[PDB]
With several copies, the nearest count.
Chain A
């Protein structure tokens, strides 16, 4: 269930981010810049940690098991033990490979899009000032300074939609 942003319309991203996992740039008149998100990066880290709770730690204390190596050959009782241990290892290795496949796919899928919150937040004030932008490169026609971007990242943004001199 890919969303087609990070491999889609976010072509490379920028590597000068040490403040989280998700970003917010700008091209204000008072110089460009960038800042990482607060709750979305924390949500991604929290679900990674929730994945790692059943992975890192919580290992089942299997104290006494069957002998898994042999020197001589005995036959029926020995190759049954080899068969059950080999089928357990094959089932658990398929389980490990499958688990890595599903939750690596899920990690790629959930760490994708969620731009829609910013899209809808910008939407109502970006309806009459020369319409909108749909990529991850929002042309926010609201002529606003760094405090405006602080309001964009700060989820508290009043909508002073810009009346005239729009749509040519």
Chain B
């Protein structure tokens, strides 16, 4: 029932730059946020679960935080394998809703 919108439609950054991506929920979703790695070929991978902890095997440069309604995802040092699209998802109340999406590109 909670719509969620990414703040940036598309953002660009260079290699090694600290890129920060954020998205906002229409209501308080407690601490339930899910960040998804939409690779260009099609392999989806989940990054951040319960809006603070990261999945096993995901590199430590991916990190998300925030509370209440405003949430963000921060990448400390970008690399070549990170050029893809991000989706952020709520799970507090049914149904789950994903974000609008944001393709990260190399400038």
Query: Contact residues of A with B, CB < 8 Å?
Result: 30-31, 146
Contact = CB atoms under 8 A, between A and B. Distances in A.
A160 B92 CA distance: 24
A146 B92 CA distance: 9
Interface residues on chain B, size class? under 10
A47 B92 CA distance: 34
Nearest to A150: B30
Interface string B47-86: 0000000000000000000000000000000000000000
Contacts of A146: 92
A111 to B, nearest CB: 24
Nearest to A31: B94
B57 to A, nearest CB: 13
**Interface residues of B: mostly helix, strand, loop or mixed?**
loop
4 contacts: A30-B93, A30-B94, A31-B94, A146-B92
B27 to A, nearest CB: 13
A31 B93 CA distance: 8
Interface in B83-107: 92-94
Contacts of A30: 93-94
Nearest to A29: B94
A52 B36 CA distance: 39
A30 B94 CA distance: 7
Contacts of B93: 30
B89 to A, nearest CB: 15
Contacts of A31: 94
A31 B96 CA distance: 11
A30 B93 CA distance: 7
Nearest to B1: A30
- Across the A-B interface, give the 4 residue pairs with the lowest CB-CB distance, nearest first: A31-B94, A30-B94, A30-B93, A146-B92
Contacts of B94: 30-31
B51 to A, nearest CB: 14
A24 to B, nearest CB: 15
A102 to B, nearest CB: 34
A144 to B, nearest CB: 14
A146 B93 CA distance: 9
A159 B106 CA distance: 56
A92 B94 CA distance: 59
Interface string B30-43: 00000000000000
A146 B94 CA distance: 12
Contacts of B92: 146
